[PDB]
Design a binder for these strands. Sequence first.
DNA 1: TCAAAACGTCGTAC
DNA 2: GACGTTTTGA
DNA 3: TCAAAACGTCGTAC
DNA 4: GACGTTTTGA
Lengths: 152, 152
Amino acid sequence: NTKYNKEFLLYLAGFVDGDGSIIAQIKPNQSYKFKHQLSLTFQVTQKTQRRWFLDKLVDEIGVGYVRDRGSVSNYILSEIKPLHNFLTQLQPFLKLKQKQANLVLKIIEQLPSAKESPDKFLEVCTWVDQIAALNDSKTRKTTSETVRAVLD
Amino acid sequence: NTKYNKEFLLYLAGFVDGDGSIIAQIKPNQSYKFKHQLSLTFQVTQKTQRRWFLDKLVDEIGVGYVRDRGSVSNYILSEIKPLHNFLTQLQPFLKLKQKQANLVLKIIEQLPSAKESPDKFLEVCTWVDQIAALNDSKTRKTTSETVRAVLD
DNA sequence: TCAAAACGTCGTAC
DNA sequence: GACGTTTTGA
DNA sequence: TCAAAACGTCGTAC
DNA sequence: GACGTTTTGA
Ligand SMILES: [Mg+2]
Ligand SMILES: [Mg+2]
Ligand SMILES: [Mg+2]
Ligand code: NA
């Protein structure tokens, strides 16, 4: 796992606290044992005319990709291992999004265990609730309650 | 002149590039010799529920203030001397807003001479045009062209 | 006559 | 910014 | 059954 | 985020 430079992390942390997102999702999906996917995403959003900025992020992070949705574009990192490595290093410098970052870390490390028991899986969905609670969440639909209602 | 930590400036630069604004305005105002005020503003916006972040900033920058504006709040720095001192030190770390930062500095250093001649005043106004051209400017009204007419 | 503050509005870029 | 639904390709 | 990508919309918080 | 109009107080 690559070691990121501190100056880079410091600036990136600031910019993430401003225009980034640390996202956790429970995605209803019939092909999973517990009928839901656990989905983590690190994202940085910027007007497409400045997507060169996001393209640099890819070079500097060395992983992830940029997707253009129209007037706006996103840097995206969803790969679990690279995500853990990156957040572990960024986390210390976050001020607005530190708890979310850490909750993500906690979730990733427990995934293996969440696969085993419906209970441990339900607990983990709770951590996702905390992430969403900390964020400026407005259009969320699938929660730990949703999972509890399905595991029956 | 108060001298800021690099760790501080690096994180703040990222956050500014994200959620900050470097604003230059020509404010129509009859009480001025050229019938407009030159206004410089450094601004950071954030949901009012995260005020404390902005309030911390005031302590850390040691100058400026926070204004709650309903559901959103703002850190503001308008005083010219601290603004020059702060921007001079922040500028090396901005990626998105570095050019307007340098333009603000130039304007500040020229203000005195700009008050002497309408021609120099006009030129300075063209630099504020440049700052607005760099920003995601959408509702601008007063430009150097409008100053130009008035001085006629 | 000026620097600075007070207060308000708009259209996205998050 | 922070979600959503559905598809891919193991 | 899964990790990850593809693709889309909502409601502000810039 | 990035403007706008109007007021304060030396
Ligand atoms: Mg923000
Ligand atoms: Mg931004
Ligand atoms: Mg923003
Ligand atoms: Na904006």
